[PDB]
Design an enzyme around this catalytic site. Structure first.
Site, PDB file in Angstrom:
ATOM      1  N   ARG A 160      22.993 -14.124  15.391  1.00  0.00           N
ATOM      2  CA  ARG A 160      24.420 -13.877  15.362  1.00  0.00           C
ATOM      3  C   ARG A 160      25.028 -13.298  14.118  1.00  0.00           C
ATOM      4  NH1 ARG A 160      25.397 -18.640  12.264  1.00  0.00           N
ATOM      5  NH2 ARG A 160      27.302 -17.671  11.464  1.00  0.00           N
ATOM      6  N   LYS A 194      11.188  -5.797  14.105  1.00  0.00           N
ATOM      7  CA  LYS A 194      12.167  -4.749  14.362  1.00  0.00           C
ATOM      8  C   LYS A 194      13.149  -4.702  13.200  1.00  0.00           C
ATOM      9  CE  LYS A 194      12.469  -4.431  19.477  1.00  0.00           C
ATOM     10  NZ  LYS A 194      11.926  -5.440  20.470  1.00  0.00           N
ATOM     11  N   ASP A 210       0.865  -1.170   0.000  1.00  0.00           N
ATOM     12  CA  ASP A 210       0.000   0.000   0.000  1.00  0.00           C
ATOM     13  C   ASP A 210       0.898   1.215   0.000  1.00  0.00           C
ATOM     14  OD1 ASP A 210      -2.765  -1.140   0.381  1.00  0.00           O
ATOM     15  OD2 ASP A 210      -1.726  -2.016   2.083  1.00  0.00           O
ATOM     16  N   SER A 228      11.803 -19.582   4.303  1.00  0.00           N
ATOM     17  CA  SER A 228      10.367 -19.807   4.123  1.00  0.00           C
ATOM     18  C   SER A 228       9.460 -19.382   5.287  1.00  0.00           C
ATOM     19  CB  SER A 228      10.087 -21.283   3.813  1.00  0.00           C
ATOM     20  OG  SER A 228      10.839 -21.739   2.708  1.00  0.00           O
ATOM     21  N   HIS A 257      -3.072  -2.415  11.257  1.00  0.00           N
ATOM     22  CA  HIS A 257      -4.340  -1.837  11.671  1.00  0.00           C
ATOM     23  C   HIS A 257      -4.213  -1.414  13.119  1.00  0.00           C
ATOM     24  CE1 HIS A 257      -6.783  -3.380   8.253  1.00  0.00           C
ATOM     25  NE2 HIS A 257      -5.971  -4.417   8.313  1.00  0.00           N
TER      26      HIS A 257
HETATM   27  C1  LIG Z   1      -5.174  -7.801   7.631  1.00  0.00           C
HETATM   28  C2  LIG Z   1      -4.461  -7.630   6.264  1.00  0.00           C
HETATM   29  O1  LIG Z   1      -4.786  -8.394   5.255  1.00  0.00           O
HETATM   30  S1  LIG Z   1      -3.202  -6.382   6.067  1.00  0.00           S
HETATM   31  C3  LIG Z   1      -2.404  -6.338   7.746  1.00  0.00           C
HETATM   32  C4  LIG Z   1      -1.712  -7.652   8.146  1.00  0.00           C
HETATM   33  N1  LIG Z   1      -0.678  -7.397   9.194  1.00  0.00           N
HETATM   34  C5  LIG Z   1      -0.110  -8.316   9.978  1.00  0.00           C
HETATM   35  O2  LIG Z   1      -0.291  -9.547  10.011  1.00  0.00           O
HETATM   36  C6  LIG Z   1       0.905  -7.621  10.936  1.00  0.00           C
HETATM   37  C7  LIG Z   1       0.671  -8.031  12.389  1.00  0.00           C
HETATM   38  N2  LIG Z   1       1.245  -7.108  13.409  1.00  0.00           N
HETATM   39  C8  LIG Z   1       1.705  -7.532  14.567  1.00  0.00           C
HETATM   40  O3  LIG Z   1       1.733  -8.722  14.928  1.00  0.00           O
HETATM   41  C9  LIG Z   1       2.241  -6.409  15.472  1.00  0.00           C
HETATM   42  O4  LIG Z   1       3.531  -6.893  15.894  1.00  0.00           O
HETATM   43  C10 LIG Z   1       1.341  -6.073  16.729  1.00  0.00           C
HETATM   44  C11 LIG Z   1      -0.085  -5.776  16.230  1.00  0.00           C
HETATM   45  C12 LIG Z   1       1.306  -7.299  17.642  1.00  0.00           C
HETATM   46  C13 LIG Z   1       1.940  -4.890  17.534  1.00  0.00           C
HETATM   47  O5  LIG Z   1       2.371  -5.244  18.925  1.00  0.00           O
HETATM   48  P1  LIG Z   1       1.711  -4.390  20.141  1.00  0.00           P
HETATM   49  O6  LIG Z   1       0.806  -5.248  20.951  1.00  0.00           O
HETATM   50  O7  LIG Z   1       1.063  -3.167  19.623  1.00  0.00           O
HETATM   51  O8  LIG Z   1       3.072  -4.048  20.998  1.00  0.00           O
HETATM   52  P2  LIG Z   1       4.560  -3.831  20.515  1.00  0.00           P
HETATM   53  O9  LIG Z   1       4.772  -3.468  19.101  1.00  0.00           O
HETATM   54  O10 LIG Z   1       5.160  -2.833  21.435  1.00  0.00           O
HETATM   55  O11 LIG Z   1       5.180  -5.279  20.816  1.00  0.00           O
HETATM   56  C14 LIG Z   1       5.745  -5.554  22.124  1.00  0.00           C
HETATM   57  C15 LIG Z   1       6.584  -6.828  22.104  1.00  0.00           C
HETATM   58  O12 LIG Z   1       5.834  -7.862  21.412  1.00  0.00           O
HETATM   59  C16 LIG Z   1       6.590  -8.360  20.340  1.00  0.00           C
HETATM   60  N3  LIG Z   1       5.760  -8.675  19.198  1.00  0.00           N
HETATM   61  C17 LIG Z   1       5.144  -7.847  18.316  1.00  0.00           C
HETATM   62  N4  LIG Z   1       4.450  -8.518  17.386  1.00  0.00           N
HETATM   63  C18 LIG Z   1       4.681  -9.852  17.704  1.00  0.00           C
HETATM   64  C19 LIG Z   1       4.231 -11.037  17.099  1.00  0.00           C
HETATM   65  N5  LIG Z   1       3.459 -11.099  16.025  1.00  0.00           N
HETATM   66  N6  LIG Z   1       4.634 -12.198  17.673  1.00  0.00           N
HETATM   67  C20 LIG Z   1       5.426 -12.126  18.783  1.00  0.00           C
HETATM   68  N7  LIG Z   1       5.891 -11.086  19.411  1.00  0.00           N
HETATM   69  C21 LIG Z   1       5.476  -9.957  18.818  1.00  0.00           C
HETATM   70  C22 LIG Z   1       7.593  -7.256  20.039  1.00  0.00           C
HETATM   71  O13 LIG Z   1       8.724  -7.774  19.334  1.00  0.00           O
HETATM   72  C23 LIG Z   1       7.951  -6.695  21.412  1.00  0.00           C
HETATM   73  O14 LIG Z   1       9.116  -7.338  21.966  1.00  0.00           O
HETATM   74  P3  LIG Z   1       9.614  -6.852  23.393  1.00  0.00           P
HETATM   75  O15 LIG Z   1       8.645  -7.341  24.398  1.00  0.00           O
HETATM   76  O16 LIG Z   1      11.019  -7.256  23.580  1.00  0.00           O
HETATM   77  O17 LIG Z   1       9.557  -5.377  23.424  1.00  0.00           O
HETATM   78  C1  LIG Z   2      15.498 -18.968  -2.137  1.00  0.00           C
HETATM   79  C2  LIG Z   2      14.833 -20.369  -2.177  1.00  0.00           C
HETATM   80  O1  LIG Z   2      13.595 -20.494  -2.582  1.00  0.00           O
HETATM   81  S1  LIG Z   2      15.778 -21.804  -1.676  1.00  0.00           S
HETATM   82  C3  LIG Z   2      16.005 -21.518   0.145  1.00  0.00           C
HETATM   83  C4  LIG Z   2      14.928 -22.167   1.010  1.00  0.00           C
HETATM   84  N1  LIG Z   2      15.537 -22.538   2.296  1.00  0.00           N
HETATM   85  C5  LIG Z   2      14.906 -22.517   3.451  1.00  0.00           C
HETATM   86  O2  LIG Z   2      13.717 -22.183   3.580  1.00  0.00           O
HETATM   87  C6  LIG Z   2      15.760 -22.923   4.645  1.00  0.00           C
HETATM   88  C7  LIG Z   2      16.106 -21.711   5.540  1.00  0.00           C
HETATM   89  N2  LIG Z   2      17.130 -22.054   6.558  1.00  0.00           N
HETATM   90  C8  LIG Z   2      17.081 -21.667   7.822  1.00  0.00           C
HETATM   91  O3  LIG Z   2      16.150 -20.950   8.194  1.00  0.00           O
HETATM   92  C9  LIG Z   2      18.205 -22.140   8.794  1.00  0.00           C
HETATM   93  O4  LIG Z   2      17.464 -22.390  10.000  1.00  0.00           O
HETATM   94  C10 LIG Z   2      19.356 -21.108   9.058  1.00  0.00           C
HETATM   95  C11 LIG Z   2      20.181 -20.951   7.794  1.00  0.00           C
HETATM   96  C12 LIG Z   2      18.751 -19.751   9.423  1.00  0.00           C
HETATM   97  C13 LIG Z   2      20.185 -21.635  10.239  1.00  0.00           C
HETATM   98  O5  LIG Z   2      21.038 -20.589  10.869  1.00  0.00           O
HETATM   99  P1  LIG Z   2      22.552 -21.098  10.983  1.00  0.00           P
HETATM  100  O6  LIG Z   2      23.367 -20.062  11.656  1.00  0.00           O
HETATM  101  O7  LIG Z   2      23.033 -21.579   9.680  1.00  0.00           O
HETATM  102  O8  LIG Z   2      22.224 -22.344  12.045  1.00  0.00           O
HETATM  103  P2  LIG Z   2      22.692 -22.772  13.490  1.00  0.00           P
HETATM  104  O9  LIG Z   2      23.012 -24.214  13.579  1.00  0.00           O
HETATM  105  O10 LIG Z   2      23.919 -22.089  13.970  1.00  0.00           O
HETATM  106  O11 LIG Z   2      21.456 -22.410  14.438  1.00  0.00           O
HETATM  107  C14 LIG Z   2      21.750 -21.878  15.764  1.00  0.00           C
HETATM  108  C15 LIG Z   2      20.531 -21.883  16.640  1.00  0.00           C
HETATM  109  O12 LIG Z   2      19.521 -21.125  15.956  1.00  0.00           O
HETATM  110  C16 LIG Z   2      18.361 -21.885  15.796  1.00  0.00           C
HETATM  111  N3  LIG Z   2      17.747 -21.628  14.493  1.00  0.00           N
HETATM  112  C17 LIG Z   2      18.263 -21.786  13.228  1.00  0.00           C
HETATM  113  N4  LIG Z   2      17.388 -21.494  12.275  1.00  0.00           N
HETATM  114  C18 LIG Z   2      16.276 -21.089  12.975  1.00  0.00           C
HETATM  115  C19 LIG Z   2      15.003 -20.637  12.577  1.00  0.00           C
HETATM  116  N5  LIG Z   2      14.616 -20.521  11.319  1.00  0.00           N
HETATM  117  N6  LIG Z   2      14.119 -20.303  13.553  1.00  0.00           N
HETATM  118  C20 LIG Z   2      14.494 -20.422  14.878  1.00  0.00           C
HETATM  119  N7  LIG Z   2      15.632 -20.837  15.355  1.00  0.00           N
HETATM  120  C21 LIG Z   2      16.488 -21.157  14.350  1.00  0.00           C
HETATM  121  C22 LIG Z   2      18.833 -23.311  15.837  1.00  0.00           C
HETATM  122  O13 LIG Z   2      17.740 -24.210  16.112  1.00  0.00           O
HETATM  123  C23 LIG Z   2      19.936 -23.271  16.912  1.00  0.00           C
HETATM  124  O14 LIG Z   2      19.414 -23.691  18.163  1.00  0.00           O
HETATM  125  P3  LIG Z   2      20.353 -23.726  19.438  1.00  0.00           P
HETATM  126  O15 LIG Z   2      20.976 -22.388  19.550  1.00  0.00           O
HETATM  127  O16 LIG Z   2      19.561 -24.173  20.610  1.00  0.00           O
HETATM  128  O17 LIG Z   2      21.435 -24.693  19.207  1.00  0.00           O
END
Ligand SMILES: CC(=O)SCCNC(=O)CCNC(=O)[C@H](O)C(C)(C)COP(=O)(O)OP(=O)(O)OC[C@H]1O[C@@H](n2cnc3c(N)ncnc32)[C@H](O)[C@@H]1OP(=O)(O)O
Ligand SMILES: CC(=O)SCCNC(=O)CCNC(=O)[C@H](O)C(C)(C)COP(=O)(O)OP(=O)(O)OC[C@H]1O[C@@H](n2cnc3c(N)ncnc32)[C@H](O)[C@@H]1OP(=O)(O)O
Ligand SMILES: CC(=O)SCCNC(=O)CCNC(=O)[C@H](O)C(C)(C)COP(=O)(O)OP(=O)(O)OC[C@H]1O[C@@H](n2cnc3c(N)ncnc32)[C@H](O)[C@@H]1OP(=O)(O)O
Lengths: 200, 200, 200
Positions: free
Chosen positions: A182, A165, A92, A141, A114
């Protein structure tokens, strides 16, 4: 009395049922439909629709249909862009992707949110803040990138992340909410996956 | 002694390859197909397919194709409903949505699940427990709502949330699994994003 | 280096714009297009395509369109397979699925990943490690299974989990990242969901 269009740019709450917005949407979503339903063999066709759908598209861009957006003309893509199946961008407002950006399947970008209070959104009111994907960024993904988020260059976003963030550059971030796991260091020039060294 | 029809209603395990269910599924996926492959300009048609597809639809309903569901006729929608791209609703049993419900892209709703024990699903047996969404609920992207879940009115579900337990009304919930984060207060009646307030 | 098809099998970094890989992909995405665009009434055509799209498919396979994959021919499926909408499989290399596997909607399987260090991917270079899903596995909605992961027999992956490491058999794993919750005991032989028993 401020054109919706100008309220978007100001980060003010707005609605989009006027001022030519719906017409813009139908133009973009029309091209989207012929792309999304084009036969895989219609490569040139797909090749032009891309140039055509987005406001900006660099060279060597590829997008695996289907792809989804609200407008299309607010998406500015850089060079050598690859996006896999179901890339959804709620543009948008401004969405900017740098060069050599790789996007995995089922990724969602959205400059729109929203108000939380159901009273500030009685008529589905929204706000929009630009997203910015830096150069050489890789998004795994099922990642969701929220309003106004900036992803620094050469960084990686793990599958399933919910980016709420700004993400600095040269890091690896993952989680819900997405957080910096990291920094990318020299070990990553040698190890490209788990226990696999670049020199076998 | 109990048909599968009665078993679904009873919350007991069942399978759906009899009692006309399959044929019911086909009717819905046929309209679904037409809806999903319709041209963005087929506005009238899209509106008529909606009131066709679902059991109930209030006035002013909008679903951005594509939409995926099992029957469609087990879904009841209130008024002023807006669902964005790829809404998925596994409605082997009743799904109820209130008014002014906003659904972000790629959201999956599911009344159905399977016994955890592989021994209970030798033939892919499932259970179905209705989902209930209050009024003025906003659901973020990539959110999944599991069987028998109830979301209290005016609540907000953050993106990527995996809802396994009931969400009370007037709350902001998020996480994996979903946790109530805070109560929606009057400070939300002024602020809508970070530090953006609203004036007269 | 060495031939590209070999690097694949050896778990080495590769690009896929040669050795007939693109053409191989076109046949895939072609049968895929034919499947994804078929009509719900064309059941017999949908069955031929399933057998044609994948390398191996046991009897009773059922895949609800749409389904997405890169080649298709790198997928081997056992028996009584069932996948709901939007199953995405990046089968740049082998993907093996056992018997009586049930897949919920919107699941993503990727044997491919990219070197996190940008210097190691200038030309979008990737690696691929097979994925093995045991028998009687049940994968919930919005699950993502990363490269070289093995899901043990009879296990269950909760909705939304991001499976980065192998899962042992007979467990229930969920989370981001996916972690083993508990082992599937005998209580699971009576209770199939929240607090519902089988006879009572
Ligand atoms: C509907 C349509 O077709 S178009 C619109 C579609 N949009 C989306 O799906 C976007 C969704 N937006 C979100 O999830 C936003 O993050 C909101 C609405 C939750 C905003 O969070 P708020 O409740 O207003 O509080 P705030 O932004 O301060 O978040 C506070 C904490 O929650 C965390 N937080 C925010 N969103 C998420 C989330 N989805 N999942 C987990 N943690 C979240 C923040 O990282 C933050 O971390 P902290 O505690 O270390 O500070
Ligand atoms: C472009 C295309 O269409 S092809 C590409 C499609 N590929 C994919 O969708 C695969 C994406 N790959 C990932 O998301 C992998 O998880 C990576 C690359 C982010 C892993 O991060 P790396 O630094 O390489 O992995 P590493 O082994 O150090 O992970 C460290 C920690 O992070 C966690 N971690 C890694 N990936 C993720 C993730 N996606 N979500 C949450 N935690 C994760 C691990 O579980 C691990 O746990 P631990 O700290 O308790 O041991
Ligand atoms: C093939 C088809 O088309 S069928 C349609 C697809 N179905 C679905 O997507 C539904 C998926 N169901 C789930 O994810 C459910 O959560 C299940 C089946 C994993 C339930 O987990 P169970 O093994 O029954 O255990 P239980 O409910 O007690 O979970 C225990 C804890 O795990 C957590 N948990 C359960 N499911 C998940 C999940 N998906 N992700 C994260 N945490 C989870 C619970 O929140 C709970 O929290 P707590 O211990 O702090 O109290």
């Amino acid at each position: 009395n401020m054109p919706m269009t100008e309220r978007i740019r100001a980060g003010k709450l707005f609605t989009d049922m006027c001022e030519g917005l719906p017409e813009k949407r139908l133009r973009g979503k029309t091209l989207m439909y012929e792309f999304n339903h084009s036969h895989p063999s219609e490569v040139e066709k797909r090749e032009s629709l891309i140039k055509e759908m987005f406001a900006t598209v660099g060279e060597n861009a590829w997008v695996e249909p289907p792809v989804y957006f609200s407008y299309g003309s607010n998406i500015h893509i850089g060079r050598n862009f690859y996006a896999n199946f179901n890339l959804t961008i709620v543009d948008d407002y401004t969405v900017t992707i740098g060069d050599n950006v790789l996007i995995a399947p089922n990724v969602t970008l959205s400059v729109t949110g929203h108000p939380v209070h159901h009273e500030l959104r009685k008529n589905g009111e929204m706000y929009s803040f630009p997203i910015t994907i830096g150069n050489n960024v890789w998004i795994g993904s099922h990642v969701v990138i929220n309003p106004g988020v900036t992803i620094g260059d050469n960084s990686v976003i793990g599958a399933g992340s919910i980016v709420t963030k700004d993400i600095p550059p040269n890091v690896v971030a993952a989680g819900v909410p997405c957080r910096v796991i990291r920094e990318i260091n020299d070990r990553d020039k040698h190890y490209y996956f788990k226990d696999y060294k670049v020199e076998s």
